[model samples]
Target: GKISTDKYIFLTPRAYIIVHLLKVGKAKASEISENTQIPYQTVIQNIRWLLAEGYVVKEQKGEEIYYKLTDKGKQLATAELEKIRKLVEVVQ
Candidate 1:
């Protein structure tokens, strides 16, 4: 109960990917997978949610689609990342 709630309270690995993308700028799902060491399928699945929620926007270049964080996404990611830092500090 508390664990589930606390996990939701902090940034999940998926959420950290958003913060990572914020720092890395724009990238494709494959790039995210490679960089994060997350499986490609998992990255695609999360990207779908992120896209639908307006956290990320897609750009088409030829056949390649790149995703980047929106301003709102950046704000949320920054706050979440800070929460992660705080939690890490608390643990340590």
Candidate 2:
């Protein structure tokens, strides 16, 4: 089955932030919230959802849980960035 883009298309700003953060190797719910300027609870909720979806992998080291991008997540981010680049070039 193909992954649907329907849900991603209508993402809130916070979701975008979370996605980008994971794509860049930014882990930890608190760090993501701080970097994205989103509320901690909100980032936590998004991270949890992403983890369940397998787009994010959680690595627990010691007492800290680190969230990172899965292969699918990286591919999605790369494709999205390429799409934006192509759009920019086409418009220019």
TM for every model, in the order presented, reads 0.78, 0.68
Give the worst 10-residue stretch by lDDT in candidate 2.
1-10
* Minimal lDDT window, size 10, model 1: 1-10
Candidate 2 per-residue C-alpha lDDT over 1-92 given as tens digits, one digit per residue, 9 for 90 to 100: 32235544644644565466655684777677776675677677767777787778888889988888878877776777677666678667
lDDT of 1 by residue, 26-90 (tens): 98888888777756876788888898888899989889999999988888888876776776886
Provide the lDDT at 67 for model 2.
80
Off by over 4 Å in 1: 1-11
- Residue 37 of model 2 has an lDDT of 71
